[PDB]
Swiss-Prot record:
Domain notes from UniProt: The extracellular domain (1-1412) is sufficient to inhibit bdl function.
Gene assigned in the entry: Lar
Function summary: Possible cell adhesion receptor. It possesses an intrinsic protein tyrosine phosphatase activity (PTPase). It controls motor axon guidance. In the developing eye, has a role in normal axonal targeting of the R7 photoreceptor, where it negatively regulates bdl. Inhibits bdl cell adhesion activity in vitro; this effect is independent of its PTPase function.
Glycosylated residues (UniProt): N145
Family: Belongs to the protein-tyrosine phosphatase family. Receptor class 2A subfamily.
Tissue specificity annotation: Selectively expressed in a subset of axons and pioneer neurons in the embryo.
Organism annotation: Drosophila melanogaster
Protein name in UniProt: Tyrosine-protein phosphatase Lar
């Protein structure tokens, strides 16, 4: 195992509404595997700071989540850094544009309807609703517990931007949200819980 760190996914610029959620994704690889560090305006991102949380996900992914987005503070460059003790560190960065009030780019995604909390009996199927519009039309994806829902799962599909889960199992319990992603912006729905009862 002898390789220098490589960024295989760069962070992308985001536009978010104030009070919103924003996230940046980074991924890298090397031999041996790099750590990824997140920087704001060149300053490593605080363990303390309540609004930022960093999620490390297998496949080499690192995610920086900012919730709730603050209009002054959060308008900055977030850079992700990868090091493994071989060669040079590799870094990539992205900006965050924050939109006050309604002064949003035309066609910024809007979520007309959002998921509601539900209890579902084991073995039953549920539909969770996201309704969105934008131009260009938003791609819609679902998150549980801040993690992308895996649509590789046989039991999970999208109907009309709705998330359907068939043959419900306890493991499906979580806090779900829907994201509508646009060239213009990203919108996250309000998180809500899915509970599974027995019997």
């Amino acid at each position: 195992a002898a390789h220098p760190p490589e960024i295989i996914r760069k962070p992308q610029n985001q536009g978010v509404r104030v009070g919103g959620v924003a996230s940046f994704y980074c991924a890298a690889r090397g031999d041996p595997p790099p750590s990824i560090v997140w920087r704001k305006n060149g300053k490593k991102v605080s363990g303390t700071q309540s609004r930022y949380t960093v999620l490390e996900q297998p496949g080499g992914i690192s995610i920086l989540r900012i919730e709730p987005v603050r209009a002054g503070r959060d308008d900055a460059p977030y850079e992700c850094v990868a090091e493994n003790g071989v060669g040079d560190a590799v870094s990539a960065d992205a900006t965050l544009t924050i939109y006050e009030g309604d002064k949003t780019p035309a066609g910024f995604p809007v979520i007309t309807q959002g998921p509601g909390t539900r209890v579902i009996e084991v073995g039953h199927t549920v539909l969770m609703t996201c309704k969105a519009i934008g131009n260009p039309t938003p791609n819609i994806y679902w998150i549980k517990n801040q993690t992308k829902v895996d649509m590789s799962n046989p039991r999970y599909s999208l109907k009309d931007g709705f998330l359907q889960i068939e043959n419900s199992r306890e493991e499906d319990q979580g806090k779900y949200e829907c994201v509508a992603e646009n060239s213009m912006g990203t919108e996250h729905s309000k998180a809500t819980n899915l509970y599974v009862k027995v019997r």
